[PDB]
Amino acid sequence: STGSATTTPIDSLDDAYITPVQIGTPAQTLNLDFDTGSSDLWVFSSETTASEVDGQTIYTPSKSTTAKLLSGATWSISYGDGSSSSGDVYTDTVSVGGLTVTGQAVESAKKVSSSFTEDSTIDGLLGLAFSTLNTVSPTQQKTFFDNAKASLDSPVFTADLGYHAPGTYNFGFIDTTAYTGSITYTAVSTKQGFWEWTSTGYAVGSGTFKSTSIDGIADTGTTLLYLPATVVSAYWAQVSGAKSSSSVGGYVFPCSATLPSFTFGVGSARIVIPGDYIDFGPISTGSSSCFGGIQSSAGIGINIFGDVALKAAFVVFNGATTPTLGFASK
Description:
The protein is mainly beta. It folds into 2 domains: about 5-175, Cathepsin D, subunit A, domain 1; about 175-330, Acid Proteases (Cathepsin D, subunit A, domain 1). It is about 5% helix and about 45% strand. The chain has 4 helices and 24 strands. The chain has helices at about 115, 145-150, 230-235, 305-310; strands at about 5-10, 15-25, 30-35, 40-45, 70-80, 85-95, 100-110, 125, 155-160, 165-170, 185, 195-205, 210-220, 225, 245, 250-255, 260-265, 270-275, 280, 290, 295, 305, 315-320, 325-330. Strands 18-17-12-13-22-14-21 form a 7-stranded mixed beta sheet. A hairpin with a 4-residue loop joins strand 15 and strand 16 (about 250-255).
């Protein structure tokens, strides 16, 4: 089997991407944030505290003839941005782009933190990291991909995120028309439960490539590119007037600037992030200070190849017995 679904930016900045997901019988379609940095499929629901729902579409398990309470199971997750959610668990039929999993754990939120409430466009998350990170207790549950894997034509999924445009998540096949050149594959460590890999270096604009190992995670659920402070300083030094602002919480730059590209290495291959991809717009409405899309990972404890980086590539999440990652230009 295969599946193919379009993923759409939630706003004009590509702050996140939503993908429609069918849950239950008859189908209830929710727009979920596919997150290769976590491993829980959780949704706003009829159980979510009413004051914490503000425009999201909710899953109502009592209206699904295939929903079953997973007795005794609870979940609770905290994300790197400080947001969180928790609740109980049903199993139900879940379909993505024509690919169907029966008995998928659907984690129903009883509580969500303010940032989830405040984002009316995201109805929940669909985790695509390794199932060892799933938070369900006392019986850990599998991700959608883990449950589908054996049925897929090939044990892979691909992320093809757009810049200011829709893109595609495919399951079970590699669309050879969706990228240019060849796909370069690179080793993955699953020791932390992430799609963790080592970039071979970087370049800023037209500058020379610096060969240096950068361990980080391919994380579709993180908006920006978080890299070591040395690398990030080297990038922003090429932008007149750019500075790190403690009060804003990262590097800012004059909105009048033209930003240089940023290249990262994948083995001997190179992925070029155009400068425009690194502009996240005014820090507040009407400001001429703009927020940068490359930020320091110092204090986060891990480097994160988030959407800024991934959207410049066609990315293969290869879930073979020994997982690997593939990157192609597009």
